Structures are given as structure tokens and as C-alpha cells.
Amino acid sequence: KPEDVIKEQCARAKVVAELWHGFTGGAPKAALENLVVEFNKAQQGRCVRPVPQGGYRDLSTKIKAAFAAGKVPTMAQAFENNIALYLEAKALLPIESLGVKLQGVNLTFLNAVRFGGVVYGVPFNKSIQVLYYNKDLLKKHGVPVPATLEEFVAAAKKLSRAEGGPVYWFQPDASTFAYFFFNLGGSYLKDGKLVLNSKEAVEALTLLQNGVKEGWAKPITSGYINQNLGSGPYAFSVDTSAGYTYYLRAAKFDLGVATLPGRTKGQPGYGLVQGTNLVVFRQASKEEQAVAKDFLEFVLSPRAQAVFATATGYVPVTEGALKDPVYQAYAAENPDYATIVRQSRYAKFEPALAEWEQIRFDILGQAIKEAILNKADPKAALDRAQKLAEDLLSS
Ligand SMILES: Nc1nc2c(ncn2[C@@H]2O[C@H](COP(=O)(O)O[C@H]3[C@@H](O)[C@H](n4ccc(=O)[nH]c4=O)O[C@@H]3CO)[C@H]3CC(O)(O)C[C@H]32)c(=O)[nH]1
Ligand SMILES: [Cl-]
Ligand SMILES: [Cl-]
Ligand SMILES: [Cl-]
Questions:
Q1: Residues 6 or more apart whose Cβ sits within 8 Å of residue 329
Q2: Under CATH, which number does the domain 2-126+275-344 receive?
Q3: What is the dotted CATH code of the domain comprising 128-272+349-394?
Q4: Contact 268, 342 (CB under 8 A)
Q5: What residues does the ion ligand 4 have nearby, CB within 5 Å?
Q6: Which of 33, 171, 237, 274 to mutate to test the pocket of ligand 1 (most atoms within 8 A of CB)?
Q7: Cystine bridges: which residues (predicted)?
Q8: Which residues contact 323 (CB under 8 A, 6 or more apart)?
């Protein structure tokens, strides 16, 4: 049990760099822990100690309480918006001040961690939405993998009519809304103001609500989509690439991965980037900062990125990982790894505002739930969302 190996390693260690994370289980936790085990074996009297804090929400709550207690870890996972918050407390060390080489890091990921031209996180476990599908059910009715939004809606209506149930499955959440929002032309910032109730937002939440009404879209309200498979016919979902191993373990059908449906066949749809960067806290000792620096270079190494990404479905964050021969041997046998990397080229982010975490869940996520689960009018729901977000941003 890797966490027991680590406990051993950290008992013999004079310097311990804690890494707080939001991995609850599955291949993400196993892959992170095996990376830490390998790192700690190459050290003398130093170690990284991974500390699970629950999910990502629990992680941000515990880090906020750790600032209030004056007792922060050396390292933590953080979304771009949590970085924006931690920078208000001036709590983060610039990554290049530690001497970490960032050559070859995907500019899409590195751009997203740059604040005032300064890098404040290391892209580590970065995910892109993909189209998951049931290869067996598409073949069953002679439906091609949809390459456009128009094709995707047609195929969902057609398969749902043949199978007697809604076959496009979705969580009624900010993450899923962002796929429809972005690919119908929407943008959250207008002249620097945050806007949740633009016509593209209404149009996106309307298309989901219409899907449920019309019997082709199924809201999943208890657990992840991959925890609901096996009850009812499933054709498609739009979901994190980091769900890959979870879909594989649950599916009693032949699982497919495709690039997202776009406006036209000229380009795949944009996917929402999720997963986290590693930050290093100023309050960490020099010695703890030197462990973090060596661990961040480890995790950016082509071999660590190849193993991590092929174990999980996360996007390798470096050009070097794609040339690593362990990556190439898995990719030669499994085209899904190339599909995920191809989708990572068509990538959008939610806004990196200090307050975004609270807005995405308690305000925008609530509006999407009211519209889908209580049939609130999309516009009235999003107009409330806007007002709640302006009041929060004002305060
Ligand atoms: N706190 C906070 N969360 C945020 C923010 N922006 C986006 N997200 C959340 O990132 C999750 C995506 O991050 P990702 O690393 O791609 O995927 C996660 C898991 O989601 C996914 N998972 C786990 C278990 C399972 O059975 N199935 C499965 O797919 O595996 C990974 C490790 O747990 C979304 C999902 C969400 O948690 O509902 C809310 C979303 C933010 O600003 N703050
Ligand atoms: Cl069944
Ligand atoms: Cl079956
Ligand atoms: Cl109101």
C-alpha cells in the first residue's frame, strides 16, 4: 500500500514537504502516490508527504483555514482561480524563483498560471473534456460518431427514439454548461465584466433543458456519470479525460473516446480544461522549498508525465512526455491517448477570479440545477445568477 511506504519514508526524514491534494481514490490517487514513492526513494533524509483533504472543494476550504491557522503545506493542487485568491494573501512563491525549468511545458497550461507575467503554478494533472461514447450502441443503429453540434443533437434524438430513453447523459453543472456555452460562441468576460446571463448562456442552458423535455438528454443527479452506467441506454457524455479509467472500469459495453463536436467540421469543439496545478507556499522553509523544486522537476520529467498521463487520462503537460518511449508504446496500442492530446489543442478556461470557485458551484451551478431539475426558465435562472454574482463581486 503506497501511502504506507510513504509513511515509512517520511518517518526517517529530517525534512518533509506536505502536498495537499483532492484525489479521493482510483487511478489518480494511485498514480500520484506511486510518483511520490519513486521520488522519495531517490532522496536522503527528505520526502514529499501527500495529504488527501477530500475533494477539490474540501482542499480549498482546508487551505483557507490553514492560512488562518498560520500552518500551510509546502505544496498544494490549485485551480487558476484559487491561485488568483492565494495571490491576494501574497502566499505563493514564484516558480522560476525556485529555479524550475519550464521549457517544453504546453503554453496553453503555462499561460493559464501566469499572473502579471509571473508563473505561480506548475501544470501537473490537467484534463480536457472529451466525448465518451458507447461504440456498441452507435454501431447498433448505424450512427457515426458526431463531429458537429448539429450532428450530436440529431444522433442523440435518433438513438433515444430507437432505445426508448435519453442517451445523452450529463451532470447539470457549470462544467457541462461550459461545453455548450463555449461552442455556441459565449464568453464569460465582456469588457472585463463577468456575465452569466448573455444570450449564448441562455441559448446553452435552453438546449440542455430542451434535451430533457424532448427525451434525448438525461440528467445524472446522484454520483458521477460513470457511477450510473448499466441502468438505461447510454450513447454519449461530455466529461473530463481524468474520468477515463473510471468509465473503463464501469462500462459493460465497448467504450469510445472522440474529440468534441464543434460548430463545423473544420475544428473540434472547445473542451473545458480542469484538473490542477501545483503551487509552493512562501511560508515553507528553504529546505522544504528545495524538496518542492526537485519534486516539481521530477513530475515535469518526460517519464513521470508519460506514466501519470497513461495511467489516468490526464493530458501530458510537456512536449517531452509525447516523445518518451513508455508514452509511445501505450499510444501505439491505445488510440484514446492521441485523441485526448488532440482535444487538448482546443481548450478553454473559466475565469481566474478569486471568487470563481464560490460562483461556479453556489451561483451558476445552482441556476443550471433550477433550470434542469425544477424547470426554471433559463433566462430567469441566469438573471438571478448574474445578480447574486454582481452582489458577491461588489462585496
Ligand atoms: N473546487 C473546484 N473545482 C473545480 C473548479 N473548476 C472545475 N472544477 C471541478 O474539477 C472537476 C474535474 O477535475 P478533474 O481533475 O478533470 O477530474 C477529477 C474528477 O472529477 C474525476 N472523477 C473522479 C471520480 C469518478 O468516479 N469519476 C471521475 O470522473 O477524476 C478526477 C480526480 O478525482 C470537475 C468535477 C467537479 O468536481 O464536479 C467540479 C469540477 C474550481 O475552480 N474549483
Ligand atoms: Cl439494461
Ligand atoms: Cl447489458
Ligand atoms: Cl433577486
A1: none
A2: 3.40.190.10
A3: 3.40.190.10
A4: yes
A5: 387
A6: 274
A7: 10-47
A8: 302
